[PDB]
Amino acid sequence: MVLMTKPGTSDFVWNGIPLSMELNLWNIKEYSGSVAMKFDGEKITFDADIQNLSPKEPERYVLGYPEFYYGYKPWENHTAEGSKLPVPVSSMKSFSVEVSFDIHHEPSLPLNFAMETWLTREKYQTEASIGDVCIMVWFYFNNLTPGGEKIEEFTIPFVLNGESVEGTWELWLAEWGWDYLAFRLKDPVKKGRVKFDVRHFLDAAGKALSSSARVKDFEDLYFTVWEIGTEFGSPETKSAQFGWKFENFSIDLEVRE
Ligand SMILES: OC[C@H]1O[C@@H](O[C@H]2[C@H](O)[C@@H](O)[C@@H](O)O[C@@H]2CO)[C@H](O)[C@@H](O)[C@@H]1O
Numbered sequence: 116m117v118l119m120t121k122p123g124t125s126d127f128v129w130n131g132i133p134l135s136m137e138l139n140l141w142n143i144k145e146y147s148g149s150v151a152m153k154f155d156g157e158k159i160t161f162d163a164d165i166q167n168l169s170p171k172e173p174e175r176y177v178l179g180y181p182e183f184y185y186g187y188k189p190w191e192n193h194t195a196e197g198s199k200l201p202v203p204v205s206s207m208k209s210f211s212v213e214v215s216f217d218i219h220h221e222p223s224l225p226l227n228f229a230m231e232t233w234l235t236r237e238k239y240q241t242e243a244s245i246g247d248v249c250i251m252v253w254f255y256f257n258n259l260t261p262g263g264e265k266i267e268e269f270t271i272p273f274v275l276n277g278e279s280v281e282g283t284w285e286l287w288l289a290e291w292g293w294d295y296l297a298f299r300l301k302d303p304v305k306k307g308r309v310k311f312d313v314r315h316f317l318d319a320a321g322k323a324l325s326s327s328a329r330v331k332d333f334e335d336l337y338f339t340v341w342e343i344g345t346e347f348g349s350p351e352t353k354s355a356q357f358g359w360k361f362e363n364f365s366i367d368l369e370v371r372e
């Protein structure tokens with residue numbers, strides 16, 4: 116059992132999987148009130164009731180991303196012990212991720228439930244820059260739109276609550292300090308169970324970036340981590356009340372030459 120009540124990172128092991136939990140309030144300059152994240156051996160929960168919020172950089176828009184992850188998160192130069200990641204995108208035959216989730220929030224709060232990875236040129240960078248990519252997969256959103264511009268839609272399968280469905284995913288692309296690609300499910304789900312293969316998203320991002328002038332040799336990039344969390348806030352938001360619970364977590368990364 117692990118508990119955190121202030122920003123920071125803690126490692127844990129869940130169902131034999133080495134993971135990292137991060138009570139991530141990366142773009143908040145100051146806050147008052149309470150935040151708590153806990154892992155009890157069977158579930159990870161997060162609860163926030165914070166006020167007196169101000170951002171560090173208004174330009175970034177969101178305020179934080181409480182989350183847990185498998186692998187090496189570049190920004191925090193951090194990995195738990197025993198992860199197979201990072202590996203070259205080309206080394207990933209399949210990467211199945213499964214998790215149950217229940218997200219709740221005050222109605223007007225901009226928020227999402229999104230997963231993400233950082234594809235980088237070198238294996239252990241401490242930042243992302245031109246030539247690198249951030250790929251996100253949004254299963255839910257409230258009062259929040261991905262950054263960049265919507266450039267297309269893809270039909271990508273996934274198992275929703277036990278049933279194979281064909282989801283419709285909007286691809287938003289932003290060319291910032293690195294490339295940002297966000298795939299947003301058009302039928303957002305606030306609570307449920309999902310199982311999917313990250314390889315499908317990597318294949319779709321690879322095609323969308325095939326003609327890029329900033330990103331080259333996509334398959335040679337290092338898939339560093341797989342983050343699961345909830346971004347929240349906006350430059351104007353002065354308070355936030357929300358929380359979540361994730362359970363039934365398993366992942367399977369299949370490595371090939
Ligand atoms: O910019 C460095 C911080 O990035 C945070 O991840 C953001 C990312 O920057 C956004 O482009 C988008 O992908 O959402 C992510 C989560 O809000 C990262 O979590 C921080 O640790 C970094 O300092």
Ligand SMILES: OC[C@H]1O[C@@H](O)[C@H](O)[C@@H](O)[C@@H]1O
Nearest residue numbers: 175176177259260261262346
């Ligand atoms: O930091 C930039 C932010 O831009 C927003 O428009 C997106 O909704 C977030 O996914 C992203 O984190």
